[PDB]
């Protein structure tokens, strides 16, 4: 078995580097090894698979190296430490992709529910989903939070997620949100016939996650919002592998920008937010859409989606483009991602003239228009909420 | 109480103060222009406050913001998500420093042993320490380990560490290594009066770390090499807080380059490898020296040491410069890091003409020459091992 690692080296004889990383980063200086040690450490020796040279102003090269799987235990910490530990500090080198062996994949859980599971839960298979976020949580009482939830639900969103900074501060406890949120969503459902899921933020010390997530499960929580890059992919994996946590996991990119934003260092967005999040149990994976306030280059956005949906020995992950999306962007979002993605309208929904209800309906209306091939102008005339949103945000 | 976060903004816009204010309110209370001014009062205490704004290739600004601690729980995951969660994705913003309240510090463990503790453990207080690593293991047996420990120990090495890439192997299992390495080191001590510690790699699933580390403690492990950035600062913190793991933790910087190498994104080296490691329990903190193949800007290397050593509510972390170091670099190293740091001679001792013992000897000889103001040319002539290392990698 072998694990392939692809890297982008931005400047620094790249073939030389490729070899050194293949041997030095798997066996170290090999020409100094005693023949005997050299003749048994051969099975641990990595090998250069390819060295291509990539469209910018700097001279960049793409390198793929095979690492004998016997070189590290079957877990993400061991893997990253082996293929991108010491190496991550070696000049301009970025880990772009990883191709796992069937055996390693056997040690990874993948999402418990994935696209199929979430859609099954919502009874919606013919349309990309709509997600909404609380306008704000900090310093707001339970009463405030509750109404925001109602308004988002009545708006028609399929999912409502907590703000990633919603911690256990005593204003609206974790277990209480799950309880009240569940009730409110049953009430909105009774009123509209539309099902909504509430993704509750899972926070606190790493050692307490397990019991908190199980508690969420027995309380009937719909989904668990988890900031992986604040706890580690392995911790998320532990959650996804727990049968006592039969709840979907929504991976938020909080902090991930720290090691993906750079075009020369860290990780590619597709690998981190796409492949690894998926393999480690993310049922949802949020990322900046290519068109919002904060954005990702289309290429990167598309790649994350492809990683989330590609056929693999894991359930597919729901890609969720986010950050400042507005209704006029849905046609774009739907052109790129197809129907298997979730449009995260974020908290902007509350800024709609008609409230969160209007923001949600503005979004639901245009995604329908796109699916029905109905001229948006025409839809805008039948749904004032959509027209208002388009006049305010444009296009 | 609140905590101060300092960011380095690159191309933050025309009005940096406005930008600073958008970040301050945006990452805290947001727009409450809809409550209105009856609750706005009760929320003023949740409002982020801009403390300072300094402006300066492209336009850059350094901004410090104060976040009320009531906005988040007393843990690192919550803290980093609050100050650098979504912001880390918003263009070129880098978190270069964090100033915790005494209330938060009370909630952190800091190093269990620290400089004092490990030095007390070795009985060495007037000399920077020497560290080395195995040559060709990670597929090696216990005998090669017991022999490499013996050679490096006898060479005067103060501490030996596994490769951070040495995981569960049938030949040399975690517990057995600890047990065997401990015996051989007791032996070298008996015959030289020189003490030496063995840092063993602590790996596996996060959920198994605690019991595994508690097991190392019972076995007499000298220190646990931990790849913190492969698990998370919060995990190391959990280890450092556990009194049933009365064992020093050695933080390896693996994977951290992905968060710090960029000059426009991520975290600063000093904050991640320095303050955060220390605050979360790291007794040692490794990082590339400014002089080897794999280098780190002198300024950042020094900054890390500064964070590790500055008087604080916690014990001091032993700074450990490492990447490809040789004896000739010692003078520079001692000039930069003084007495309280460890020189990670990596394989700069194994690749020595007289083996790891000669290499370790070469290092001990020159750090002594520096301390006693003895010329490297004179000390060399006295120590055949030093002469050889110098004539091989370059003189002082």
mmCIF file of C-alpha atoms in Angstrom, chain B residues 181-322:
data_model
loop_
_atom_site.group_PDB
_atom_site.id
_atom_site.type_symbol
_atom_site.label_atom_id
_atom_site.label_comp_id
_atom_site.label_asym_id
_atom_site.label_seq_id
_atom_site.Cartn_x
_atom_site.Cartn_y
_atom_site.Cartn_z
ATOM 1 C CA UNK B 181 15.974 3.477 26.575
ATOM 2 C CA UNK B 182 15.592 4.172 30.278
ATOM 3 C CA UNK B 183 17.907 1.345 31.303
ATOM 4 C CA UNK B 184 20.703 2.153 28.850
ATOM 5 C CA UNK B 185 20.597 5.784 29.994
ATOM 6 C CA UNK B 186 20.821 4.752 33.642
ATOM 7 C CA UNK B 187 23.924 2.790 32.617
ATOM 8 C CA UNK B 188 25.661 5.598 30.735
ATOM 9 C CA UNK B 189 24.992 7.851 33.699
ATOM 10 C CA UNK B 190 26.515 5.358 36.109
ATOM 11 C CA UNK B 191 29.694 5.313 34.038
ATOM 12 C CA UNK B 192 29.998 9.029 33.218
ATOM 13 C CA UNK B 193 28.142 11.048 35.840
ATOM 14 C CA UNK B 194 26.403 12.658 32.885
ATOM 15 C CA UNK B 195 22.616 12.487 32.809
ATOM 16 C CA UNK B 196 20.660 12.227 29.570
ATOM 17 C CA UNK B 197 16.929 12.099 28.791
ATOM 18 C CA UNK B 198 14.995 10.264 26.087
ATOM 19 C CA UNK B 199 12.036 11.973 24.362
ATOM 20 C CA UNK B 200 9.701 9.365 22.912
ATOM 21 C CA UNK B 201 7.129 10.080 20.215
ATOM 22 C CA UNK B 202 3.536 10.100 21.540
ATOM 23 C CA UNK B 203 1.212 9.207 18.659
ATOM 24 C CA UNK B 204 -2.092 7.571 17.796
ATOM 25 C CA UNK B 205 -5.686 8.715 17.798
ATOM 26 C CA UNK B 206 -6.411 11.819 19.921
ATOM 27 C CA UNK B 207 -8.856 9.833 22.027
ATOM 28 C CA UNK B 208 -6.030 7.449 22.990
ATOM 29 C CA UNK B 209 -3.364 10.021 23.887
ATOM 30 C CA UNK B 210 -4.298 10.458 27.542
ATOM 31 C CA UNK B 211 -4.164 6.809 28.556
ATOM 32 C CA UNK B 212 -1.101 6.306 26.382
ATOM 33 C CA UNK B 213 0.692 9.227 28.044
ATOM 34 C CA UNK B 214 -0.446 8.170 31.521
ATOM 35 C CA UNK B 215 1.135 4.819 30.612
ATOM 36 C CA UNK B 216 4.419 6.502 29.618
ATOM 37 C CA UNK B 217 4.507 8.279 32.973
ATOM 38 C CA UNK B 218 4.222 5.017 34.914
ATOM 39 C CA UNK B 219 7.051 3.609 32.758
ATOM 40 C CA UNK B 220 9.413 6.458 33.594
ATOM 41 C CA UNK B 221 9.320 8.214 30.214
ATOM 42 C CA UNK B 222 11.657 11.219 30.334
ATOM 43 C CA UNK B 223 9.619 13.301 27.945
ATOM 44 C CA UNK B 224 6.893 12.970 25.371
ATOM 45 C CA UNK B 225 7.613 14.244 21.869
ATOM 46 C CA UNK B 226 4.235 15.546 20.696
ATOM 47 C CA UNK B 227 3.305 16.822 17.225
ATOM 48 C CA UNK B 228 0.839 19.383 18.620
ATOM 49 C CA UNK B 229 -0.109 20.896 15.271
ATOM 50 C CA UNK B 230 -1.260 17.515 14.036
ATOM 51 C CA UNK B 231 -3.695 17.239 16.953
ATOM 52 C CA UNK B 232 -4.370 20.749 18.232
ATOM 53 C CA UNK B 233 -3.174 23.046 21.003
ATOM 54 C CA UNK B 234 -6.213 22.103 23.033
ATOM 55 C CA UNK B 235 -5.188 18.471 23.035
ATOM 56 C CA UNK B 236 -1.684 19.233 24.298
ATOM 57 C CA UNK B 237 -3.268 21.460 26.910
ATOM 58 C CA UNK B 238 -5.367 18.504 28.083
ATOM 59 C CA UNK B 239 -2.190 16.471 28.462
ATOM 60 C CA UNK B 240 -0.245 19.206 30.282
ATOM 61 C CA UNK B 241 -3.166 19.701 32.675
ATOM 62 C CA UNK B 242 -3.304 16.020 33.631
ATOM 63 C CA UNK B 243 -1.401 15.422 36.889
ATOM 64 C CA UNK B 244 -1.239 11.721 36.010
ATOM 65 C CA UNK B 245 1.155 12.643 33.214
ATOM 66 C CA UNK B 246 3.959 14.142 35.330
ATOM 67 C CA UNK B 247 6.076 14.102 32.190
ATOM 68 C CA UNK B 248 7.563 17.019 30.225
ATOM 69 C CA UNK B 249 6.085 17.619 26.785
ATOM 70 C CA UNK B 250 8.258 18.395 23.758
ATOM 71 C CA UNK B 251 6.329 20.204 21.031
ATOM 72 C CA UNK B 252 7.505 19.502 17.496
ATOM 73 C CA UNK B 253 6.623 22.181 14.891
ATOM 74 C CA UNK B 254 5.463 19.618 12.312
ATOM 75 C CA UNK B 255 2.740 20.978 10.023
ATOM 76 C CA UNK B 256 3.087 24.455 11.588
ATOM 77 C CA UNK B 257 4.887 25.894 8.566
ATOM 78 C CA UNK B 258 1.495 25.726 6.906
ATOM 79 C CA UNK B 259 0.190 28.278 9.457
ATOM 80 C CA UNK B 260 3.216 30.517 9.884
ATOM 81 C CA UNK B 261 5.519 30.588 6.877
ATOM 82 C CA UNK B 262 3.485 33.136 4.934
ATOM 83 C CA UNK B 263 4.281 36.782 5.726
ATOM 84 C CA UNK B 264 0.685 37.852 4.976
ATOM 85 C CA UNK B 265 -1.463 35.007 6.356
ATOM 86 C CA UNK B 266 -1.770 32.698 9.341
ATOM 87 C CA UNK B 267 -0.080 33.177 12.697
ATOM 88 C CA UNK B 268 3.314 34.625 13.580
ATOM 89 C CA UNK B 269 6.015 32.149 14.566
ATOM 90 C CA UNK B 270 6.438 33.765 17.988
ATOM 91 C CA UNK B 271 2.734 33.452 18.811
ATOM 92 C CA UNK B 272 2.219 29.830 17.674
ATOM 93 C CA UNK B 273 5.535 28.136 18.406
ATOM 94 C CA UNK B 274 6.193 30.536 21.244
ATOM 95 C CA UNK B 275 3.388 31.867 23.423
ATOM 96 C CA UNK B 276 0.602 29.412 22.558
ATOM 97 C CA UNK B 277 2.819 26.321 22.874
ATOM 98 C CA UNK B 278 4.137 27.515 26.205
ATOM 99 C CA UNK B 279 0.736 28.634 27.499
ATOM 100 C CA UNK B 280 -0.697 25.243 26.563
ATOM 101 C CA UNK B 281 1.898 23.072 28.285
ATOM 102 C CA UNK B 282 4.962 22.746 26.066
ATOM 103 C CA UNK B 283 8.156 22.235 28.103
ATOM 104 C CA UNK B 284 10.239 22.366 24.910
ATOM 105 C CA UNK B 285 9.407 24.009 21.631
ATOM 106 C CA UNK B 286 11.327 23.098 18.507
ATOM 107 C CA UNK B 287 11.763 25.283 15.470
ATOM 108 C CA UNK B 288 14.252 25.726 12.604
ATOM 109 C CA UNK B 289 17.314 27.712 13.625
ATOM 110 C CA UNK B 290 18.168 30.793 11.528
ATOM 111 C CA UNK B 291 21.282 29.054 10.206
ATOM 112 C CA UNK B 292 20.453 25.671 8.689
ATOM 113 C CA UNK B 293 19.131 24.522 5.317
ATOM 114 C CA UNK B 294 15.592 24.725 6.670
ATOM 115 C CA UNK B 295 15.757 28.195 8.169
ATOM 116 C CA UNK B 296 13.554 30.634 9.982
ATOM 117 C CA UNK B 297 14.106 34.410 9.836
ATOM 118 C CA UNK B 298 16.505 35.355 12.636
ATOM 119 C CA UNK B 299 13.934 37.821 13.978
ATOM 120 C CA UNK B 300 11.221 35.154 14.336
ATOM 121 C CA UNK B 301 13.580 32.562 15.785
ATOM 122 C CA UNK B 302 14.566 35.114 18.446
ATOM 123 C CA UNK B 303 10.958 36.158 19.005
ATOM 124 C CA UNK B 304 10.051 32.538 19.739
ATOM 125 C CA UNK B 305 12.807 32.332 22.341
ATOM 126 C CA UNK B 306 11.581 35.620 23.827
ATOM 127 C CA UNK B 307 8.033 34.269 24.167
ATOM 128 C CA UNK B 308 9.375 31.018 25.644
ATOM 129 C CA UNK B 309 11.443 32.730 28.253
ATOM 130 C CA UNK B 310 9.714 35.989 29.230
ATOM 131 C CA UNK B 311 8.647 36.230 32.870
ATOM 132 C CA UNK B 312 4.995 35.225 32.991
ATOM 133 C CA UNK B 313 2.428 33.376 35.085
ATOM 134 C CA UNK B 314 3.887 30.144 33.702
ATOM 135 C CA UNK B 315 7.193 28.283 33.775
ATOM 136 C CA UNK B 316 9.545 28.970 30.874
ATOM 137 C CA UNK B 317 9.551 26.816 27.758
ATOM 138 C CA UNK B 318 12.907 25.491 26.554
ATOM 139 C CA UNK B 319 13.444 26.963 23.073
ATOM 140 C CA UNK B 320 14.976 24.381 20.764
ATOM 141 C CA UNK B 321 16.532 25.658 17.489
ATOM 142 C CA UNK B 322 17.072 22.630 15.200
#
